[PDB]
Amino acid sequence: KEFEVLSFEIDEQALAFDVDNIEMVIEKSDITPVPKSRHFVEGVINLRGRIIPVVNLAKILGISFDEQKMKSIIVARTKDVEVGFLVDRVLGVLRITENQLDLTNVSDKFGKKSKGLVKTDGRLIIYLDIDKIIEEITV
Amino acid sequence: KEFEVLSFEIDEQALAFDVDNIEMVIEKSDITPVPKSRHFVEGVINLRGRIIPVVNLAKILGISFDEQKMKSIIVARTKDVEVGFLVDRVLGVLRITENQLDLTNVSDKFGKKSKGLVKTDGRLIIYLDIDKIIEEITV
Amino acid sequence: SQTVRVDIEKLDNLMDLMGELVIARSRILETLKKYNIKELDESLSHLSRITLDLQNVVMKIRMVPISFVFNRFPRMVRDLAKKMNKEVNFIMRGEDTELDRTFVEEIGEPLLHLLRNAIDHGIEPKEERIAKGKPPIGTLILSARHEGNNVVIEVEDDGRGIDKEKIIRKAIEKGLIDESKAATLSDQEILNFLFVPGFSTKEKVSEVSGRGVGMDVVKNVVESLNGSMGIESEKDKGTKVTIRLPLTLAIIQALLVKVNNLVYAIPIANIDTILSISKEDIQRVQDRDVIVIRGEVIPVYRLWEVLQIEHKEELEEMEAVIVRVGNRKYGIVVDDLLGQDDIVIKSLGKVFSEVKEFSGAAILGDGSIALIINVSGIV
Amino acid sequence: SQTVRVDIEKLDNLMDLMGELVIARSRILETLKKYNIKELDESLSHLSRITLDLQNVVMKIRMVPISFVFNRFPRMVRDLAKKMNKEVNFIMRGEDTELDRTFVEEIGEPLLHLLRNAIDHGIEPKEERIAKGKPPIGTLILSARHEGNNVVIEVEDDGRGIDKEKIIRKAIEKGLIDESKAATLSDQEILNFLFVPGFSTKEKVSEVSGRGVGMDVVKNVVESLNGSMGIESEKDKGTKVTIRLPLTLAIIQALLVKVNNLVYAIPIANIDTILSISKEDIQRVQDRDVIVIRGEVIPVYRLWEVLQIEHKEELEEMEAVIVRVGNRKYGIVVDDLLGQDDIVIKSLGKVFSEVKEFSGAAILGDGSIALIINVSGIV
């Protein structure tokens, strides 16, 4: 299968999840505070007439990050919920080949909510599982 | 019977019809010309969301007028139609009594369209009937 | 399950208030033209979009599916067929096809007559079909659909068909056509004399007063609702009648022109070209003004002359619109060209009944009044 | 004029367009107070006039009479009267009382099980009716009306009444309440045990008439739709049931209050009064504070505390909002009081469902998000 994913970075590390679960992408501006909210969330924004929660991806994966550097909110779309992810730069749509996709889950510490790792001669594009990431926020 | 009528003049001649059959009163501003119009009509205006014809009363009755002096449109109201009547100055609302009302209209041009003649305070106020006046203008 | 019951008059009132929002949209555009602010340009761009989406939904819910009128026919048609002593299959398709409130109410009785005449003349009794070696059960098909930004309603039988030789010869006998014009006219064109009075006898059509619904009436009603109607027939192949009606009266495409700075709308569908002509060219032969265009001779008319209104004295290079009517086309000279739009036709008024040049007034988007020219009203 | 059909999907899209039009009204209003333009006020005011007319037309087609939905229900009561060999008169006064279509659908089979248990339970046979000298045919009544931000459904009978004296004794068997508490209670709180799930689960699998008295099934639905239900009963005076539900979908009349300049809306429907209190009058007897206002003692809560927002500095005269909950009412002390307006609830989604304190955001006229306090969620 030829998978189409959205490529984007955090802290000099490439990441990506499918285009199937994308609403659009925007640049950060003031995020409305919600009182007594979970620590891995920034707040809420109004996007296309809907109230989208703005999650901080790196606090879900447990990876190192620098908060000021981030400025791109990637709005996702699942059947359960629609959620924005604050990150660094974005590339766009990257067609990946099944031949170059490794499925090992013990390679790095966030490998269980990662669907795999795309091998390449540039920065290694890690394939996430949107599903298991939304499954984390609702517990 | 105590009928309350709308009093107004044309070339110093007094006239009046009931308040029961009134929509409003306005000053003539840009009446749209309709090509091939009969001699007694000025044209049409949009009032209260409806397209109202502006007739020139004195050219229906058969009496004198000045068309730069006349500048008041009295908009009427029957079950059938709403039509504006272009005339001179207006006085206002007058309660009339049967005791000062005469039915002699033997010598009048519009005397079979007149309900009577009101002999109030030295004036000769002729009482009109909107219905029979509107039946003449229709084609 | 749930669904809404509402009067048509209430959605007609919701359409009316929608047309007030168009004027208010035009008043915010006036403020935008004076004050030129990107915020308000954006706010008006969103309001323009919402008004366009909203006017589509109101118009859509107001349109009536023709199914109520359609399912009035099968029981009426069967009783007629039985009394007429014949057997037909009725095939009815496109049942919930949507058209205007005015059109669904007007068309029902003329289409009942069209169907009634199709079984009476067209569909043979069984014994006649058995004599022609043909299948004894007739087939009558009524089919409605959307095409061309309009509504199409097809009616056809497998019946006798119409003698085209009888229609053409009767047109000569009643003095309605010349012998060489008759001999050059095509089959599809000859069957239009069916829609001219006196080519059928049924249901009170010779009457001076209180006349019935003839086949002439059916063609005239379709045309009166601004549509078009066609016929084609052949021996033992039955007769086929095609009716094309607009969707609604709220989308009548026009070219708005001005004379004396007064808006006059011109029906786009009829047109043929728009041309700026010179004052040197125009000439008179032995009648009213003509212009030689493509080596052909076109009878040019001055809008302000045919409408009897005071206008400019002096010659200039004038803009003309060539409009088509019947098999011909005349020129209409106008002063300035405003701009096209799909308008809403309203009544001219009951003090103006005698005027033949205008079919209907209309309220434009800026609240301006504009009358709509009748293409066959000027000669 | 004529009744036509509009389906709910078409009305759902029309509702969204009405929502996009209200946003455009607010975005021109933002632009207007930004640039301070006198002429743009007039332009907008006319738009706002037509929009008010359109809004109330759209609300009329959104709402439905209850007896349009409940149309088969008097026939069902006749058939159940016939089955049990009882004479009863059913009175239904619901034709002028309009309710939302999502609310009416969820509460209909609930209400049917209430009436179906009532015809068995409280409606008398003729022998037992005339044994008590009561009018010879039973009286069971459905009716409704409109009150403020709500629509009130009312059910009443002249039947047996409910055995309240036995219900407290049964409640002690089931372990529902204490006996000294049962002696404290007033009659309408005894009947409130018929609105406890699991107090009676008795049903018929033959009839399929609803569990219990057909009332804890209704109460769950009424609470789910954010309403409020009451009951009263007396032996051989019959029973009466009161049901309050929201006037329209999504719209919530509110009082906007602020903590550290953050907008938090307070539901005006639930309220009881607004007062400026001193901190020198706030006292305590148990674990939490109170204030004696109007002679009554009200359990005060600090908005900023239950939401965990830091309080920088303290001023003596505090603004308080008194809100009603259940049969009672608590005080909400606020930092600033902005100003009322009627807002529209927006979900925060699956990640924020857990929080009792707030069940919904809302979009203000400056484009700002503001959350709505849940009155029964705090306490």
Author numbering:
A (entry chain F), B (entry chain D): 9 to 147
C (entry chain C), D (entry chain E): 293 to 671
Give the authors' words.
core-signaling units, involving the chemoreceptor trimer of dimers (TOD), CheA dimer and CheW monomer. Core-signaling unit/complex: 2 TOD, 1 CheA dimer, 4 CheW. (A) TOD: receptor trimer of dimers. cascade that regulates the motile behavior of the cell.
